[PDB]
RNA sequence: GGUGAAAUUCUUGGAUUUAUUGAAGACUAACUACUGCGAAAGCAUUUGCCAAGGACGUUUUCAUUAAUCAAGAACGAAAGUUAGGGGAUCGAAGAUGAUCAGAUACCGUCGUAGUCUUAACCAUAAACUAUGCCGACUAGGGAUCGGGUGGUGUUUUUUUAAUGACCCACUCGGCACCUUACGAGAAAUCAAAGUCUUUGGGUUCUGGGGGGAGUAUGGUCGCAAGGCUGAAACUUAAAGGAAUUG
């Protein structure tokens, strides 16, 4: 719940102590269940296979990725999100990717993360359509809908609020040096109006 | 009327060639449709050959010639003195000299 | 105010041993400051060469050649082969109406980890006691050409290393190569690998480049 | 009988919520509901469990796809691109 | 017993650029142009100004080392007219008789193995 | 080139169809040449490998899962291994294909 | 006038016109 | 930098210019042709795969299975539209600096949609070779493309050997081309626009002076843009074609 990307219960045998090891992972578009999982620097290079970033090469299509080697997954976590492996840096053990957000990141080798991109794809492409939709998906998520707008709002209630026509009044774009009560609106806003023109 | 037995283009049953670009105004025509020189020129002029030897070197040198391919529209062509305006009899005359 | 050409030391340029005469050019870089040292700076760059001046003859007054430099020793910089491509006058000049090229392309890297792209450039030749006005190919014969021509290239960069490459291509033996394998075939008038680009460096190997220049 | 024209699956919604927001979730329902064949069986018996999983109604296997359909086109080029790499680097 | 430089002109329309280069071409020599020898805005692409741009270069050129000088003509390239403007002929020409050892002239100008967009429009300027 | 033969097979030849006559085909020893689909299970496919090393005939891999074989015998049905009981005028027992 | 632009007045005039005469109905 | 000339623009923080890379997106220049394929619109990088084809050859095979084509159907440049990705160049709109008397146009700089792609729509162009499709016949020629045939012809390591390219005589099909008009046409011109007052091979569509007008309405298709069908009133004695002279 709370989440598109399916999870699969990855099992492995522990090598330490007689006893599996049943382990979440974020289920990437190709693997069903009984498949093989080959996690680690001497795996192959399959859909759903774990490798360390360094061994993969360039041009392909990662997910699930470590910032630094050691905090189990943290980018492209989304449904039908990716990271793609731009280049590498053998001389000082770090590669570089390309962010989901279209950011270019330097990444440790020794990080890892499964191959493919994440299950659930094209969630975002057909719209929640009514109000029950939106309803039960946040109910899974967090008390954050619905979201009054704060021009509705009274003057004591939020910083938009107020006045006998629904106004902003002072511009909708915050200050990043604002403080915490500032921040309603556009906070720290670059280029306002539309993208692409 | 009918000016020509070919409109004004290389083209026979295609349908469709390709845009070009001119070299003077930059306008898209059809790369049959335009002015083809094979403009072949030294970097240097005629009588510039004998300082280049006297400042060279090279005794034996190359002599090297460059060369570009003009693409020309008729409208610039005209003006640009690439090609005259000729006798309607003296049109179907498609000899180069 | 302060006059640029009064602080620099001429270095010059060590051209690898299987060439003619090793010395090219004197370039100014700097002084060797205290801060940053003249042989980083030196370091990374390139110099176009003509091979004709790499090897005396007017024979190959194109096919102008790329070295980067690697080592400096005091002023004189060693350098290896980092490319070469024929100058702009030779391509337009052999590459005439009424005659079909060939372009030929293959991505093999040498014995080593140091891998280069391999051109090659072929022209569709006016035969003895022939008569059509243009002689062009048949598309089929320049598939089967580019496929012998590739075959050619690649069992040759990958059977020898660079500096075997160079030593064997300047008397050029290669381009005579693709020519008796494709006499079979059709006949072609301008032969050449005509382009060669350096990708990527393994570990430099003083011991290698000290071989080149010692 | 033909019982619409061109609301085919969305007709469900009413008159409600306009046309062109029906028509975008016309053609991703049919995707849907749509049964697809099993890579695994042969035997167009995959429904849709959940978002993005993909149980195939015989022999109890369910992979992991997209949301809306068993395999995303986006994907597609994901495992072909994944076999290049792994095709140049062994051979 | 001699030294070889790039002379490296870019010889286009509306400025004229005459600047000799070490053999590597990184270090730059006395890049002038026209702009500073005409202030008229209309030899500087003429023959003239290319000239007299091209004429300074040498009088700095010797001096320093610069014995002879591997001209590389260029035009402007890439998407536009590609060939050289008047200067690319005069301001050869003030180097050739300045004293400066001209050898390996050649053209280095940007052709697109295929180009984009040209600037002006499918039907193209209109005057 | 493996579709045409096996419409030889399925008109002058004997064959069987399907697993567990495959296997009751190989357990008697009369068939000698079994083609399994690629869509068949790894697992069904494996112990058939192994049944056809214990009978010692030939084993041929479908360049196709159950649907090209269930075409390819001339089923409309699909078709996990079909067995060649015995070969007609058709040559594919003969050939090493 | 050319056919194009004679053509492209009348139909900036028939869209006018359709508006208009749905705007009533 | 730009111009016919300038100015707007960027520049002692370094523009422009020089070199090295790195990425992004687009396209496949030269070669490139009175050349090829495609039903048309279109198609110009390599390589691989998939399947489709036309021509050729055939002493193979089915043996009237054909041609055209209302109704109907697929494809259909560009522009445009919807959702997503992409977003280098150019660039509607827009903004600017010039020009003129005015210049919201031509010129220059920036620049949005767009140009690119995935999946759908629209179904239009001077979509033109302004020449429906099929069939036969009538004059000569030359080249060119593709196939085929023959030469004790040339040409390929071996000097009639392990065999492609070429030249010759051809032929089939194609894009076309040069002369001539027998013939036609109003002529321009056409080897098909010829075999039509010596009027009839088959067949489909379209036109009836110009405007109004491809407009109004009505229907249908379309997300819309709009497409298809499509008048009339009223109005004029002419528009129009091809050539001659000025």
Redesign the interface.
Known sequence: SGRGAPLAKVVFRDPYKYRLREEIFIANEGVHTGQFIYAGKKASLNVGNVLPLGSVPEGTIVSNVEEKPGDRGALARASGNYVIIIGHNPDENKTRVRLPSGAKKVISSDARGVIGVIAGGGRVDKPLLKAGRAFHKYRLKRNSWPKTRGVAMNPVDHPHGGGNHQHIGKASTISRGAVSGQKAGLIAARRTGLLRG | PKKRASNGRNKKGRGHVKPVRCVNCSKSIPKDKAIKRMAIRNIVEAAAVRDLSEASVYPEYALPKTYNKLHYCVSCAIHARIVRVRSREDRKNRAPP | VVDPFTRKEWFDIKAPSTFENRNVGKTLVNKSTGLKSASDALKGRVVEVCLADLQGSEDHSFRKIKLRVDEVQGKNLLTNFHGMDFTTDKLRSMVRKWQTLIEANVTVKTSDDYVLRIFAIAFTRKQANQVKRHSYAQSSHIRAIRKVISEILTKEVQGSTLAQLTSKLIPEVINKEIENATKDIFPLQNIHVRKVKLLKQPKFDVGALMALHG | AKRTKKVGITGKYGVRYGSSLRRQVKKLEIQQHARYDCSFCGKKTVKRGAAGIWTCSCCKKTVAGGAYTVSTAAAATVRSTIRRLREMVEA | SQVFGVARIYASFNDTFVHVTDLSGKETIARVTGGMKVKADRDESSPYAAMLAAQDVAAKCKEVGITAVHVKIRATGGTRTKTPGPGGQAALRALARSGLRIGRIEDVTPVPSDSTRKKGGRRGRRL | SINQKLALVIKSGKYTLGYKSTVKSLRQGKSKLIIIAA?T?VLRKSELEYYAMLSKTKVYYFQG???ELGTAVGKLF?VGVVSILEAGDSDILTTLA | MRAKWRKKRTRRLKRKRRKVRARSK
Request: glycine share 16%; hydrophobic share 0%.
């Open positions: 869509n299970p899962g159950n649907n699909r």
